[PDB]
UniProtKB/TrEMBL annotation, chains A, B:
This is Succinate-semialdehyde dehydrogenase. One of its GO terms (biological process) is gamma-aminobutyric acid catabolic process. It comes from Physcomitrium patens. Residues 33-492 form the Aldehyde dehydrogenase domain. PANTHER family: SUCCINATE-SEMIALDEHYDE DEHYDROGENASE, MITOCHONDRIAL. One of its GO terms (molecular function) is nucleotide binding. The keyword NAD applies. Belongs to the aldehyde dehydrogenase family. Its EC number is 1.2.1.24.
Length: 502, 502, 505, 505
């Protein structure tokens, strides 16, 4: 035969991305797109097909040092622009992300696997942080504080902290980049970001659009490869004043310890193990829809995912039946195909963890209501699963599954469920469903979690502060408060001041 | 002879303190004043006389664990009181500190050595944090954020973080206790505090007055002795959610690293190396008075102390002459004696550091204008000193002296002085003197320091945020912002909400 | 000196009056600057106890001349008071707060004597009224200015907030202490001085409060108290250049005239006027909570509160059970003299108030309302009225359309949520409203939908110093209580610094 | 169709008018709901170019009936507009902002044609006026409510902020675009609808702005524009129940009447009235900064700004050097038609304005003032007046006491700082003031001391959308620009939730 023999299954999509200038195979340091110093690379694979999409550089310490130096050089000028000037440029970036949302969504699907509707939704959500902080840049207010000394006047100024090092995970290849880069740039900081080596392409496309928006070279730098070597260069640098990380708890704890030697500002978001309480007086349809959305978005691979569901005795049977019917409607497959609502797990390690959790639960008495095996598609597709008769001795109760498995734990009293929900070292998201005003407010107040969905399974938004309590993190992303993570307060005391006349 | 043979030189003062119930020889754990588990003790000595004032317990890990358990038990009830209820109790504590200020001032003099006027001033200043946060407790405002989803409503709540571990240094035996304890208690947290083993008595007296105010047992706990063992118990505890430390940079960096393993919230204030810029157009009298106060308060032993003075070429001679005349008016001695304005350095290690700094400067060309030797009183008294012709190669330029030594560095241009002032890893206080509005605002904006005194050498106040940039710290103490260090934000998303009618 | 001498009129509660007089809290003069004064012509007005008819004392009948002198004293005192630190004003205001609380039992008795409410409610009013003094003593130190990012590189932008100047305050009779402190405390905290005209019906409590202000160290002229010819005093307040802000609580008709009159000198005006509070009891209300809440929200102060429930809309499914349980609750109330323990309803303030209540009840019964409990003057006579419930009320009744200010609760049946909310919003009033529902969606919806400045949701007692109180529509302008209450007494100033330099390095 | 036909009056700047008409920005009708309309009786008023005397077009002469119809359209549109999300309103307002900026050059020319200012100032006004639209598009999403710590364990306390309702806005002629957007942008952002009456002297720019609002997707009835009988329109705005807030910028006499009239329905009112801005040049001013700043602060818009410098107090030591350098600066100004490049002074708006300027100059010269530059009508005639400086001015002169609104700068010598500050504060005006000093203590002191809503310190050009603008004393109520500007269009609501439970564990 004669004809095109593609190496991959989605060449038309990759060609369209490349024609749009959104398909990159190099990192970004200052005013250049670059390879690693020795030309080494790593493959980026499509999780639904196994195919290599492209190689990207395998960078380390030296490239990270060069990126930090570029960011440090760019900081002086960027930080001294007016807020209005930074705001205009950031809005241009926001507009370009939205203009390119359909192609950027497809790029997320290719490298990370989620359904196209979720990927395009991630562009809209991620871009919203850029818009939000473009507006908030102009609202970094200082204070004039009444002085108890007649001869003194007291001010508070808020100024950018300096060069920021940012590390982002694979589960939201765009939004985890903008949630960190947007506030940093708005405040007047510059950044060195290390996206996940599993999903770097979307970060590179976002950086290309930042350059097109007029973000000066060196304000945004993107490096990837040897995550440990890059992270150590970020921690060892004097010029890096702040480090922001989202990812695994074990890695985050090491980063936080390492940041202590230079007293860096740190914000981080780590593992969660979100409880969801369905009370007897929940609106059943609202609860089923909210739990389905909160558990199975991104095939369970979200930091705010519902991990365990406590269901009150009176509603248990009706909830379990309606929830199983809802879960049975999910469809796994390649995210570029219409009607697909579950993508593959990111890799074999993730699949093996899901299988370990399910095997442990079934060995301790859990009942498989739906699913409980690898999907017929193979690879890293796992059937959406519900485990009935779950308990506090199970691995899935104690640890974050990060997959499409919903364990149900029966409970009797409200106090019992709230105390169980609060009995862990996690503190990211939690959820509750009840129609009663007193009960709803009480549960929301009582839960020891940074976010609470009350009659809501989809809580993500750029306007509100997201982050963890206890061992789930430090600091917040989104809202006015997210910008404070990138600022230093300064108290200025003016002396030898005079009394007003007449 | 017949008659009283006191062991110390200030028995009348110690008897008056004891009669007032302010002289303690035990720690405080829950509802009991306690010894160490094995009865071991450490002496607390008067630095002006060498005499033992009293012994206090030499506690460690086990007592710290018991104090944390008491704080954890007390937290449930204290955190659930209304803000108004906590506020009333904290105001009672504030009133008792002020009522007892003269005796509490004398206790600081005995254990730490500063002049009585400075010690009574420290009570007024330290007590002011108690008042401030009693008022601010009622002003922990949450938010209602406009929701971009018509069917959702969005709230932000702010709630106490939990048990706090606090470590305080010796240079402000009262104010470093209240700066940490007051916001923690106001927010609804409970505390375990380890005062300096050099100056624990004032902390114990403050805790006695807290009990008299109606602060419930276990809300405030005070332990001391094996600082490493106590600190390790604080870091290892799950229940300790936040740790606040003021002290040496080396110890602080180890604490911050150690806190990473449980993802604790940390705020800390470390070494500073404050530059002071005297421009050619400074008001000479204002500059001399401000530099004298900012350098020599507490014999130079303040975290915000002026460490190095940059003096512009045109004013150099007139400043050096007037400043030497001002420094020559200082008088060293026992802080309980009238007219004394310089107390002894805390210990022999501090004296040896001062001597090392002076010897290094003189070996590199500095000119002793005033002082430059141990005072005739001996012990740890050091003559107030001025070193002319100082330079950036000197130990005193590069490191925190924490003593009564003022080095003068000549400079030519404004830009030169600002760049030199900003060329370190310190970032706590800085000072500038200029009569010009443009120059003054410019220098205040340019300085990379958490606090700036502009035509002011005495900047301390509870109403404004104090803390460090770069390697000088994390977080702030004082002002509305100080309370945020003890709170966790919670976003609550209400779903299935209806549109307003008509 | 012999017990038969008549210089002090003999009467009931003489022991209480003697104890108040001994405490320095029983006054028969106004306060202008550093003097307690009579009116220039020695005219007076009597203050009578509404439960007994007995004279308590007389107060001056002052007018224009005395109001001008009080304004001049306040203007003279403003210069120094406004330039004190916030901390200095805060300390003095806390001393006043502490004195009010120290004297609460005697001050409560004084409110009972002149206004009539039960002693427990009067002592509660002292605690509530004094709370504004404490709140604004703290808030004085929290008048924050701003530093705003400048879009011009060479400029820096600040916002300062400074006291407006002399304030004229006019207070009504239903809370003789709290209506004084709600206005005086924020004004003083900001650094303003005040001329206050308390109600001529209940002036004694204001004078006692002013004596305690002087004892607290509030300098003479910072607080001045005048009363008598309300129109003449009000016209002097409006005509004065130096009065920069007026604050008024009282009748809508008088408030509208004051607002119009303030226009000629462009004064800042805050006011709180008539309300006509609807209360919606939905079918899914917790019955006990609704009954208890409506009982409290309607009958406190015998219905004489600005935020009192005026009309209750009850959903068809809960109507019968609510009406029965509510009648049983109301039957427990007991009218009498507020100094007698066990009494829970005092007399209406005067005969005009009683006649308005009788007019509302007669109109309702003539249009088909059913008297479920009460509906007549109490056997005690004077201005005591039986606690009343009118079933089968409608939108054509005077009590539906106008503020009754008395112990009468009309019940209006409704079918749908939307019907009740549209009905509740169909007036020019906009002060308080109330709703009872256990459902989260319905509760938030009703609270958002109601066109009122305050909403009680599963709550009949909403008053607090920490939250902003005031009216929408024709019920008022501005707010009292909360951080926002202090802004009524401040002027914003934008300061633009030019020729500024770029930061170095 | 033949060039000799007279349907379109021939004249100067026809190319510009044709380009504006082609762009959809040249209107001869008002806007009520979904229609562009004439007055009910077809009456009109002409709009003439002040530099040429030529007719631009006519606009309707509307009155009470049309204002009532506009209010009804705004009331109908309010229900839906107020219930959109803030994000939805923000997107639409940003589309309007972008359209104003896209059309800035043509809109600038339209301002020149009807109002007369130089084209550079008119295009600058579009950028400044449009900035309010952008600012409040962003601020719409930042209308934050509060959760307040409750002193009652069983209650929770919230503060919500919701749009006030239909707004009536009245704007003057000196900034034909920015005075429209400063009022319309925050109103729309909050969720209010508007009826605006632009100045009958400069209505075209408002109509162009409203066409662009419709193109942006602002629904019909959200913005309505009426003009003609200003008294009849204003009375319809005041008489309407549905108008909940009035905002007015213009003359003090008219503003005081509107404020008085608003009292009968207890409307929220914000207004900005006459100013009489003092400018203090201290002996230690940077001479160049003061000269440049006073030049800009006095002569922008030929002195026809609300914040224009009205009187300059110059300290004895710097007087001679300032007067000499300032005269040299002023000599550079050039009067003419604003469409001619190089022109920096346009004509005064009308003959009444010119006569007031002549009255002020004649009064000053009769009382001893020295004409340093100008002091007569410009050789161009019409309403052009020579830029003038009057030396040796005093407090007995009309120009010291009253707002000149023209290109005349009077200089008053003073000796001490305290003298100048007391003099600057001795009026009933309170809008802008200015000061020039290099000293930090003196600068902060003067800024704190001045009894004015805005202070320029070493700055003669202070206008910005990011900071609060408005007057103290008789210069106004409320603020425009900054986060605070949005509060003028909101009502606070306190919601108290009762029967709440204690948190668990």
């Amino acid at each position: 035969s004669s004809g095109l023999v593609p190496r991959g299954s989605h060449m038309g999509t990759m060609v369209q991305l490349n024609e749009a200038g959104l398909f990159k195979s190099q990192g970004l340091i200052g005013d250049k797109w670059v390879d690693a110093e020795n030309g080494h690379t790593l493959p980026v694979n499509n999780p639904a097909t196994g195919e290599i999409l492209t190689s990207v550089p395998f960078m380390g310490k030296r490239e990270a040092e060069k990126a930090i130096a570029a960011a440090s050089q760019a900081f002086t000028s960027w930080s001294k622009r007016t807020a209005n000037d930074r705001s205009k440029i950031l809005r241009q970036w926001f507009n370009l992300l939205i203009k390119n949302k359909d192609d950027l969504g497809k790029l997320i699907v290719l490298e990370q696997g989620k359904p196209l509707a979720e990927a395009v939704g991630e562009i809209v959500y991620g871009a919203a942080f850029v818009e939000y902080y473009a507006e908030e840049a102009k609202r970094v207010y200082g204070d004039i504080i009444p002085s108890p000394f007649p001869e003194k006047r007291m001010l508070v100024m808020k100024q950018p902290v300096g060069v920021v090092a940012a590390i982002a995970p694979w589960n939201f290849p765009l939004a985890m980049i903008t949630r960190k880069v947007a506030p940093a740039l708005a405040a007047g900081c510059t950044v060195v970001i290390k996206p996940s080596e599993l999903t770097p392409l979307t970060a590179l496309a976002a950086a290309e659009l930042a350059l097109q928006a007029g973000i000066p070279p060196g304000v945004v730098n993107v490096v990837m490869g040897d995550a440990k070597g890059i992270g150590d260069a970020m921690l060892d640098s004097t010029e890096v004043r702040k480090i922001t990380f989202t990812g695994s708890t074990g890695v985050g704890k090491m980063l936080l310890a390492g940041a202590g030697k230079t007293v860096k500002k740190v914000s981080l978001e780590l593992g969660g193990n979100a409880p969801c309480i369905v009370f007897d007086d929940a609106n059943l349809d609202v609860a089923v829809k909210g739990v389905l959305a909160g558990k199975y978005r991104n095939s369970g691979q979200t930091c705010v995912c519902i991990n365990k569901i406590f269901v009150q005795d009176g509603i248990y049977d009706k909830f379990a039946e309606a929830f199983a019917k809802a879960v049975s409607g999910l469809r796994a497959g390649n995210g570029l195909e219409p009607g697909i609502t579950q993508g593959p797990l990111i890799n074999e390690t993730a699949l093996e963890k899901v299988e370990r959790h399910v095997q442990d639960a079934v060995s301790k008495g859990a009942k498989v209501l739906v699913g409980g095996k690898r999907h017929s598609l193979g690879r890293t597709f796992y059937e959406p699963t519900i485990l009935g008769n779950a308990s506090d001795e199970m691995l899935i109760f104690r640890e974050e599954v990060f997959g499409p498995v919903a364990p149900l734990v029966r409970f009797n009293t409200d106090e019992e469920a709230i105390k169980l929900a609060n009995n862990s070292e996690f503190g990211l998201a939690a959820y509750a469903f009840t129609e009663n005003i007193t009960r709803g407010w009480r549960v929301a107040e009582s839960l020891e979690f940074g976010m609470v969905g009350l009659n809501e399974g989809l809580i993500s938004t750029e306007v509100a502060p997201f982050g963890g309590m206890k061992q789930s993190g430090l600091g917040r992303e989104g809202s006015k408060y997210g910008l404070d993570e990138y600022l230093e307060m300064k108290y200025v005391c003016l002396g030898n001041m005079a009394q007003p006349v007449g």
